[PDB]
Design an enzyme around this catalytic site. Structure first.
Site, mmCIF file in Angstrom:
data_model
loop_
_atom_site.group_PDB
_atom_site.id
_atom_site.type_symbol
_atom_site.label_atom_id
_atom_site.label_comp_id
_atom_site.label_asym_id
_atom_site.label_seq_id
_atom_site.Cartn_x
_atom_site.Cartn_y
_atom_site.Cartn_z
ATOM 1 N N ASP A 208 0.580 -1.250 -0.111
ATOM 2 C CA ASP A 208 0.038 0.240 0.123
ATOM 3 C C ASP A 208 1.058 1.045 0.223
ATOM 4 O OD1 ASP A 208 -2.563 1.117 -0.275
ATOM 5 O OD2 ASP A 208 -2.716 1.602 1.708
ATOM 6 N N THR B 280 -1.219 9.028 -2.937
ATOM 7 C CA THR B 280 0.016 10.012 -2.444
ATOM 8 C C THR B 280 1.066 9.009 -3.467
ATOM 9 O OG1 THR B 280 1.011 10.020 -0.809
ATOM 10 C CG2 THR B 280 0.195 7.923 -0.836
ATOM 11 N N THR B 281 0.874 7.773 -3.674
ATOM 12 C CA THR B 281 2.018 6.830 -4.585
ATOM 13 C C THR B 281 1.830 7.518 -6.086
ATOM 14 O OG1 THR B 281 2.679 4.413 -5.829
ATOM 15 C CG2 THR B 281 -0.037 5.616 -5.358
#
Ligand SMILES: Nc1ncnc2c1ncn2[C@@H]1O[C@H](COP(=O)(O)OP(=O)(O)O)[C@@H](O)[C@H]1O
Lengths: 514, 500, 197, 505
Positions: A42, A75-76
């Protein structure tokens, strides 16, 4: 050159997360503490738990988690896009283009992206009217594990979630995950899973001296409790009088029987035992007389009370009750029927009036594939919740990124200033999400991103192929799929806001020079 | 370990020549011993220029040269196939197989591959001496060397070599030779009968159709001048007498036409305009220059004595190609030697090239073309080359390995894998991921088509039928290729330690 | 990976250290304590407590030998030599690629034959004083100076004769050796009954 | 290939080589060199695994998954690491030559699915309701590990314990992992009289000479109708000023507990349950009571002991009003052995705390028994749902590899190669057995695989006790279905969890 070192550090922290992008992304090792190692793919978890000593990585990750906490997942993608544009801006700086020039270019590119995404590639909350197809595609791709049975999940989800309606600012049609209750079960043929348009649970049998077994025109929202094992201690150990703490216990049991007689007199056939019942009391009151339940899920209890327009806290001060309950808990379910359903002794309640919620019982076979099923349903419900609660959706995968790249390259070729390369190179760098997804999909990125570019060029240069604007990739595939028969999607608000924060992070980290 | 060290040489040689395998293969520059630089595709010339100090490399080298001796087509196939075979043998020895059992399995698998490869023959060159078939047959070798000139070189080789097959039994490959035209377009090359040479010939063009050639190497010399002491002479008699001697020598030439019959002569030494007008009054021709190789080859083929003697023609030099001519095709004059009779009716290609570095590469291409024409001449049967035969043999060998018990089973399986290793190398050269294309083609070969091969010109891993494409390959060439490849491989795997 | 070679070498070293000690004619060895005192001994039981064993698997062999010899204690040294020779031949046969587990199986079969053949080697007789003093002599001479062994052996056979009524083993309660420093050994015989500290 | 992935592969191979030859009934020995002194000889792989903790790659994941498999199952579970190491070694052969880190995962998922399918195929049925068969099979399987003589003694008692353990859940029909199957280290005595104990030890009753003896009906009484909370901290919270005053204020609440325990005396139950503590001074007064007070029991105790008893929740000794689970405790026995008289309570057809009657001058036999009954637990648990069990012992590996490769021969795509690679990598267990027994590893492997290629030879294998290719059918040695399937499950799961790693920190 210290800004180039910032560039190297940001590229490193981006390469740490690159392989974790996408659902097929590989897991990552990261060790915040010597005592344990964390296995997670994640993006939010790996960015939050990991830290990098270099200040530039601190700034980049701080903006990334700002994005994460303020607009949700993504966010990645923010880290990857921002650091790729960062490295490419460094490439421009080696070309003697001053950092402020690429700052202005990134700002203009972000502005044009916000305008273009909201204008040309967008759906007006209707899914173009093909909701009963995108969901059908979506359930397929949201749940690879299920495979064959397929379309039935879609045909249930569409109406089981459209049956929901939250109340909020101007009443947005957001339908939360908890609006449906997941009832894990197995033992039957793997062909069906009865959705309860309403809620379902189980109760005592034989002791059903009340009309819940049959059609109930009116219902209740009442709690319940019966005890003889020392549940209520009105007097404490403060004094040692040997025979002086057993009569209050038994008399509390008797007055609780008086309470339930005061409840059973009014009837209304919805009676739900609250927690705290000891196992000794459970085996006592099956014989001693109890209109009880086997302490059904308290989360389900709260969602049931919400799904009936009446919560016990509005009339009683607690979940047990000693004062007489007001009639506020008079429920209003249209239909309540008990059935030997799915070869189990459930109670089935239809779509209760006022505020309501949904549910499903699983017609599964064995424990573990039904666990898999309980997981796939959660995934499908949550992701469709994302899609609809977004109230505006951009084509997911690499479609929007490739379209934005080609459009911004054309804009750069039609802008003419000191930051002319900034727009085009921002566009070229922004292909990193298609590139990363193709790499993580075990495919050659130089070919998949190539097909994305070709399709988007043919779509936005010749207007005859408007529908060709909606092809992208997210998962291992031999040919990129179109987002009108397929249904991989991302909320346009979170995607555009993540792009804006990636651009802003790049600006902030390039504004630091020496 | 000694055996692994021995294998490593063949490993590195296989990786060296792997890039150059087949069409779309990587080019290589090799440096001559005199620092001459030229790029080439022929692995045989790569080995010619690449020194091989390690004895195993030399083993594979004379394996490739024995391939040259038998059939030129497939010389690189031997080297890369032996390298893959030793790779799989290294894998077996790492597993723990004894060398003897590996050799036994490789030999039995090679024997059954030899007996089953003719069962893979799709068709044969049924209609030789017709351009339509033979040009397409030559196309595969041409593309194997040079991919930019598929059909033009193939058809010129067709129209040439068809003219050197009247005997219907066999012919000598030397009867097709190449000549050099520098600074010229490649498409302007054309076929001509008999040997032709670009460089000028002295005297007016007579072209006597019965000029029994006076054969010499350097019957004339360069400029000299005597010194009376340390300082030079001061008389022109040394030049006047030389001129009169040349005049009387060619007067004796037009006398000795009775026993020699020479209207033409060849030399490697300079002559002057005095010889020009002497020839004009005597009606003879004299080629002023040829290279050492050209002079020597002319010497053998004319079947006459050649020597650098300032002497009029003699009886012991009867010319073979007495019907001499001249030509100018490709905007460049060329002298022509021919003979009308069909036996040994030598012909040549006037190779036209703007770059010598490309010129010797297309020389190697035409050499492989005439070699594969020889292969078709000795055996018309053809096999679906282009990795199709490789995967077919691999599948059959794997079927044997699964059906035959015994310790050799691993050897059979890895020999099949070595066969599989040729198309993956070809895919690496073409620029496509080897694993996916190998898997796809292998899955296609499991049913239906027995001849389908991979498409080199496609970007995505693609496999296309070989017959409808027409890039088939020689039966006998492939048979001898695997025979020598496995023979060299087992010989080099048998050696346990090289000794000083 | 022939990592068992170092274990065989350790067995070789411990065998060499325990070599030269067999028989009355063999040498003895001294154990210099960390306190700097002196300790002469010949029996392998306390020689395998020489805490300068210098190598770990050698310490393993020493402690297991002591543990397996404490039951009888007449056969402890010899044990080190037999295991050393087994491992010598085992090394001789590993050096040609042979796997040690079949070697151990052969050792087990050899033991199964050897115990049965030993059961026939043994002689059975009523333990008269002559044979008893002979066996005491041959057991004690391999640990003491030859000229002094016999005067001990007579007291030993007297001690073991004092408890012949019942098959119970050696117990310290009926035989308590007591010592005091003196100029000469002078007939270090037992005394019947108990002696006070 | 990704360099860090190859490092994970190398670490997995390192640990695999640590215990690869430490497998099977003829396992090789391993030495642990402790730098501070001492040394251990051990061929029980899990002992090495627990001790060899110096690893600091992502092989932490492998070690923890091995410990999870050990605590859940334990017996013979060391093979999971050998399987994982071999599969990762053959994974590297593709991952390094051409990068494809995800399609190998799909190949391993397909391999796991097809392995499950083929194990459910080649297996041989067994009954679970007749002694004449499972006695033989479990006796053999238990004898494989560490037992020479006590096989026939310990097997009966452990298997009878699990038969009693059977039917606990009454829903999923799944018995405990360990919540019931405890054990007590009963010391000394004649070791051969170690017999069945279809009940559980009740430790802290008879420490005093006069505690309680031989009550039939499991009566208990709580603070319901004849007992009260006013036994507890009934005057004031405890204060600390000095040891004498601290003991006096402790004995304050202790004496009020004594007062309500003396009221318990006239109630005369079989046992009572308390969670805070009881006073021995009142316990001396329990001759007419004949009661025992058990104190400071955890929720696990008040669950399993109480439902092992099926305790009668009475108010007076002359009545029956409520039982936890009927007359669960059929009998209660105290054998007059040991300083603490061993009280054994007997329960029937019920989920209950477990302990076996054992006797031994040494604790090796008294510690083998629980790891025998754990194997018996796996056998009963898989046979009760699947009446089925697998050849095992490296024999089934060749059958699975042959079936997997046969399926692969009809499989397209690039995933074909790693899937057949898993087929070949599975051969390590028979390979390590043959290498362990000193026979020709390659020759015997080839013979066994070729014979498995023949029809209906899916049970053929190698005898680890002799080092030969003889059939494992009708030889008597087998492996449980659940153990074998879970071994493949954990092996492929740790393989995927190690290949899914492609960076650290
Ligand atoms: N257009 C093509 N497509 C696929 N394969 C081809 C094509 N052209 C040639 N090939 C194959 O590639 C092989 C390469 O062998 P090669 O080493 O080049 O032979 P040589 O070096 O002796 O001339 C040839 O045997 C030929 O069959």
């Amino acid at each position: 050159t210290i800004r180039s070192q910032n560039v190297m550090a940001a590229a490193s922290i981006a390469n740490i997360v690159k392989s974790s992008l996408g659902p097929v992304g590989l897991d990552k090792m990261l060790v915040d503490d010597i005592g344990d190692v964390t296995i997670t793919n994640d993006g939010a978890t790996i960015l939050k738990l990991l830290e990098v000593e270099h200040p530039a990585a601190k700034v980049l990750c701080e903006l990334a988690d700002l994005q994460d906490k303020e607009v949700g997942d993504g966010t990645t993608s923010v880290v990857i896009i921002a650091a790729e544009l960062l490295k490419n801006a460094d490439e421009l700086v080696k070309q003697k283009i001053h950092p402020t020039s690429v700052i202005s270019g990134y700002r203009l590119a972000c502005k044009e992206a916000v305008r273009y995404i909201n204008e040309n590639l967008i759906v007006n909350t209707d899914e173009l009217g093909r909701d009963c197809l995108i969901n059908a595609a979506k359930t397929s791709m949201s749940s690879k594990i299920i495979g064959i049975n397929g379309d039935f999940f879609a045909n249930m989800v569409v109406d089981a979630v459209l049956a929901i309606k939250y109340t909020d600012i101007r009443g947005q049609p957001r339908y939360p995950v908890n609006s449906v209750n997941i009832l894990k079960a197995h033992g039957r043929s793997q062909m069906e899973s009865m959705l309860i348009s309403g809620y379902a649970l189980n109760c005592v049998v034989g002791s059903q001296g009340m009309p819940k077994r049959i059609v109930n025109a009116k219902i209740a929202c009442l709690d319940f409790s019966l005890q003889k094992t020392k549940m209520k201690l009105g007097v404490q150990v403060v004094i040692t009088d040997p025979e002086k703490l057993d009569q209050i216990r038994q008399r509390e049991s008797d007055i609780t029987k008086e309470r339930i007689q005061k409840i059973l007199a009014t009837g209304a056939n919805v009676i739900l035992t609250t927690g705290g019942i000891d196992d000794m009391c459970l085996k006592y009151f099956v014989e001693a007389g109890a209109m009880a339940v086997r302490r059904v899920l308290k989360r389900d209890l709260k969602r049931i009370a919400k799904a009936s327009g009446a919560t016990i806290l509005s009339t009683l001060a607690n979940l047990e009750g000693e004062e007489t309950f007001e009639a506020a808990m008079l429920g209003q379910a249209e239909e309540v029927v008990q059935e030997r359903i799915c070869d189990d002794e459930l109670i089935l309640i239809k779509n209760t009036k006022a505020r309501t919620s949904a549910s499903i019982i699983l017609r599964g076979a064995n424990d573990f594939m039904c666990d898999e099923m309980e997981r796939s349903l959660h995934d499908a419900l949550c992701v469709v919740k994302r899609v609809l609660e977004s109230k505006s959706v951009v084509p997911g995968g690499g479609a929007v990124e490739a379209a934005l790249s080609i459009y911004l390259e054309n804009y750069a070729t039609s802008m003419g200033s000191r930051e002319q390369l900034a727009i085009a190179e921002f566009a070229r760098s922004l292909l990193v999400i298609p590139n990363t997804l193709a790499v993580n999909a075990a495919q050659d990125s130089t070919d998949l991103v190539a097909k994305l570019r070709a399709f988007h060029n043919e779509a936005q240069v010749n207007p005859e192929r408007k529908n060709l604007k909606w092809i992208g990739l997210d998962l291992s595939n031999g040919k990129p799929r179109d987002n009108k028969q397929a249904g991989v999607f991302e909320p346009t608000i979170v995607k555009v806001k993540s792009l804006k924060f990636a651009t802003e992070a790049a600006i902030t980290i390039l504004r630091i020079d020496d | 370990e000694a055996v692994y060290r021995n294998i490593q040489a063949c490993k590195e040689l296989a990786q060296t020549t792997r890039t150059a395998y087949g069409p779309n293969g990587m080019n290589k520059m090799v440096i001559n011993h005199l620092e001459k630089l030229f790029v080439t595709n022929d692995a045989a010339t790569i080995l010619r220029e690449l020194e091989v100090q390690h004895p195993a490399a030399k083993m594979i080298v004379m394996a490739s040269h024995m391939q040259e001796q038998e059939v030129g087509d497939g010389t690189n196939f031997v080297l890369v196939f032996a390298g893959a075979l030793l790779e799989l043998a290294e894998e077996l020895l790492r597993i723990g197989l004894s060398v003897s059992e590996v050799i036994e399995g490789y030999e039995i698998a090679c024997r059954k591959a030899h007996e089953i490869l003719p069962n893979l023959v799709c068709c044969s060159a049924k209609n030789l001496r017709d351009i339509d078939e033979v040009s397409s047959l030559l196309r595969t070798s041409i593309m194997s060397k040079q991919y930019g000139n598929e059909v033009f070189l193939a058809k010129l080789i067709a129209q040439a070599c068809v003219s050197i097959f009247p005997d219907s039994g066999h012919f000598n490959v030397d009867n097709i030779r190449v000549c050099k035209i520098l600074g010229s377009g490649i498409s302007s090359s054309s076929v001509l009968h008999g040997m032709v040479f670009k460089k000028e010939t002295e005297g007016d063009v007579t072209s006597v159709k019965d000029a029994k050639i006076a054969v010499y190497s350097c019957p004339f010399d360069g400029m000299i001048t005597e010194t009376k002491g340390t300082v030079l002479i001061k008389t022109a008699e040394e030049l006047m007498n030389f001129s009169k001697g040349e005049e009387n020598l060619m007067d004796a030439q037009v006398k000795a036409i009775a026993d020699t019959g020479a209207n033409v002569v060849v030399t490697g030494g300079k002559v002057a305009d005095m010889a020009l007008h002497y020839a004009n009054k005597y009606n003879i021709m004299l080629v002023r220059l040829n290279s050492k190789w050209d002079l020597r080859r002319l010497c053998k083929t004319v079947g006459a004595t050649a020597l650098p003697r300032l002497t009029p023609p003699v009886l012991e030099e009867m010319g073979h190609c007495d019907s001499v001519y001249l030509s100018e095709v490709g905007d460049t004059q060329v002298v022509v030697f021919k003979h009308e009779k069909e036996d040994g009716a030598i012909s040549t290609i006037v190779l036209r090239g703007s770059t010598d570095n490309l010129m010797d590469d297309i020389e190697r291409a035409v050499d492989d073309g005439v070699n594969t024409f020889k292969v078709l001449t000795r055996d018309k049967r053809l096999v679906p080359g282009g990795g199709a035969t490789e995967i077919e043999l691999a599948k059959q060998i794997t079927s044997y390995g699964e059906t035959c018990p015994g310790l050799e089973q691993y050897a059979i399986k890895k020999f099949a894998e070595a066969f599989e290793a040729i198309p993956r190398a070809l895919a690496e050269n073409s620029g496509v991921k080897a694993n996916e294309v190998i898997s796809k083609l292998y899955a296609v070969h499991q049913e239906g088509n027995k001849n389908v091969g991979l498409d080199i010109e496609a970007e995505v891993p693609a496999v296309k039928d070989m017959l409808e494409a027409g890039i088939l390959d020689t039966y006998l060439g492939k048979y001898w290729a695997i025979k020598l490849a496995t023979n060299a491989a087992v010989t080099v795997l048998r050696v346990d330690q090289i000794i000083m | 990976q022939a990592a068992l070679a170092v274990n065989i070498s350790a067995a070789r070293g411990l065998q060499d250290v325990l070599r030269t000690n067999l028989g009355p004619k063999g040498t003895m060895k001294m154990l210099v304590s960390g306190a700097g005192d002196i300790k002469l001994t010949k029996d392998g039981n306390v020689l395998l407590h020489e805490m300068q064993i210098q190598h770990p698997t050698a310490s393993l062999i020493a402690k297991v030998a002591t543990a397996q010899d404490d039951i009888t204690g007449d056969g402890t040294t010899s044990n080190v030599l037999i295991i050393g020779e087994l491992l010598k031949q085992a090394d001789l046969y590993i050096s040609e690629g042979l796997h040690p587990r079949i070697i151990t199986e052969g050792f087990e079969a050899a033991k199964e034959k050897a115990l049965q053949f030993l059961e026939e080697v043994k002689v059975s007789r009523e333990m008269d004083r002559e044979t008893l003093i002979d066996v005491a002599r041959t057991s004690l001479r391999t640990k003491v100076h030859a000229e002094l062994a016999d005067v001990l052996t007579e007291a030993v056979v007297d001690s073991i004769l004092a408890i012949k009524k019942q098959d119970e083993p050696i117990d310290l309660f009926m035989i308590e050796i007591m010592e005091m420093k003196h100029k000469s050994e002078t007939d270090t015989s037992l005394i019947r009954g108990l002696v006070l500290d | 290939g990704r360099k860090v992935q190859s490092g994970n592969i190398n670490a997995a191979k390192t640990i695999a080589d640590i215990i690869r030859t430490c497998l099977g009934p003829k396992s090789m020995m391993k030495m642990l060199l402790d730098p501070m002194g001492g040394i251990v000889m051990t061929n029980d792989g899990n002992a090495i695994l627990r001790e060899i903790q110096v690893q600091h790659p992502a092989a932490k994941s492998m070690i923890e998954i091995s410990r999870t498999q050990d605590e859940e199952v334990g017996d013979g579970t060391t093979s999971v690491i050998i399987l994982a190491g071999e599969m990762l070694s053959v994974a590297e052969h593709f991952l390094e030559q051409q990068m494809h880190p995800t399609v190998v995962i799909s190949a391993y998922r397909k391999a796991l699915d097809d392995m499950i399918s083929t194990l459910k195929k080649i297996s041989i049925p067994v009954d679970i309701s007749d002694s004449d068969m499972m006695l033989n099979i479990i006796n053999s399987s238990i004898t494989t590990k560490a037992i020479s003589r006590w096989s026939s003694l310990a097997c009966n008692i452990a298997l009878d314990a699990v038969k009693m353990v059977q039917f606990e859940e009454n829903g999923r029909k799944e018995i405990d992992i360990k919540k019931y199957a405890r054990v007590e280290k009963i010391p000394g005595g004649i070791i051969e009289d170690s017999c069945v104990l279809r009940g559980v030890m009740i430790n802290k009753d008879v420490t005093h000479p006069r505690m309680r003896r031989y009550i039939k009906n499991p009566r208990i009484v709580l603070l319901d109708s004849s007992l009260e909370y006013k036994k507890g901290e009934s005057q004031t919270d405890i204060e600390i000023t000095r040891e004498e005053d601290f003991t006096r204020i402790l004995q304050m609440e202790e004496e009020y507990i004594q007062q309500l325990c003396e009221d318990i005396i006239q109630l005369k139950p079989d046992v009572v349950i308390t969670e805070k503590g009881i006073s021995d001074l009142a316990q001396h007064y329990l001759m007419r009571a004949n009661i025992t007070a058990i104190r400071r029991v955890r929720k696990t105790d008040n669950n399993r002991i109480a439902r092992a008893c099926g305790a009668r929740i009475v108010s007076r000794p002359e009545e029956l009003r409520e039982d936890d689970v009927g007359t669960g405790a059929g009998l209660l026995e105290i054998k007059k052995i040991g300083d603490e008289y061993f009280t054994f309570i007997t329960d029937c057809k019920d989920p209950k705390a477990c302990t076996i009657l054992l006797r031994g001058a040494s604790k090796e036999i008294l510690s083998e028994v629980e790891r025998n009954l754990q194997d018996a637990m796996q056998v009963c648990r898989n046979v009760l749902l699947d009446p089925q069990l697998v050849p095992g012992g490296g024999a089934s590996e060749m059958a699975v590899a042959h079936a997997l490769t046969e399926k692969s021969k009809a499989m397209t795509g690039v995933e074909q190669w790693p899937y057949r690679a898993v087929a070949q990598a599975l051969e390590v267990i028979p390979r390590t057995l043959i290498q362990n027994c000193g026979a020709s590893t390659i020759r015997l492997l080839t013979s066994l695989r070729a014979k498995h290629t023949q029809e209906n030879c899916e049970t053929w294998g190698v005898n680890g006790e002799t080092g030969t290719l003889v059939d494992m059918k009708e030889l008597g040695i087998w492996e449980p279905l659940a153990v074998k399937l879970q071994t493949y499950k954990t092996a492929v799961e740790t393989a995927v969890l190690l290949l899914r790693i492609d960076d650290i920190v």
